[PDB]
Design a protein around this ligand. Structure first.
Ligand code: ZN
Ligand code: ZN
Ligand code: ZN
Ligand code: ZN
Ligand code: ZN
Ligand code: ZN
Ligand code: ZN
Ligand code: ZN
Ligand code: ZN
Ligand code: ZN
Ligand code: ZN
Ligand code: ZN
Lengths: 66, 66, 66
């Protein structure tokens, strides 16, 4: 898709206003998407920590039985 | 809060200049905040790796004693 | 580096157009860099998970031999 820039100064200002509103939206969206990815990675890390802590309890039980 | 856009072309250009300076700031801020979150997650991961490596040394000691 | 803003309205509009094209580029770049950092952290997490799962298999072998 492709449209010529306005030549009229007022029209050009209004187009730039629109592009500023669009860039504000893009910034917010890709911040949210990045937040979501990080929280998924955190959830995966914390599950690993939980599983490893259970293994440690299993190893400690084994040491009792030696 | 709400203020009408300037009608004068020069005033409108100067407002858009201001909004561009403000968007540059927002971009930098939310990049830094995202960096900080990632480095905290990395610190948590590396501590886990350290703890797991210690468990491995404990398991290896146990194997000696069998 | 430092250059005075254009005074002419059309020239000023064209400068602001340029800065909008530059901010679009900065946004994309720092999104990609942030993506790259996250995927490296994910690779490190998944390797840890792999190593821990191997330790669990080693512990389970030890339990057989008790
Ligand atoms: Zn949002
Ligand atoms: Zn955690
Ligand atoms: Zn679970
Ligand atoms: Zn127990
Ligand atoms: Zn900064
Ligand atoms: Zn690391
Ligand atoms: Zn520690
Ligand atoms: Zn030892
Ligand atoms: Zn890209
Ligand atoms: Zn994974
Ligand atoms: Zn490996
Ligand atoms: Zn086996």
């Amino acid at each position: 898709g492709h449209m010529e820039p306005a030549a009229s100064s007022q029209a050009a200002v209004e187009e730039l206003r629109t592009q500023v509103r669009e860039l504000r939206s893009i910034i917010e969206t890709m911040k949210d998407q990045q937040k979501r990815e990080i929280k998924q990675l955190l959830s995966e890390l914390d599950e690993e920590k939980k599983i490893r802590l259970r293994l440690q309890m299993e190893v400690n039980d084994i040491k009792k039985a030696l």
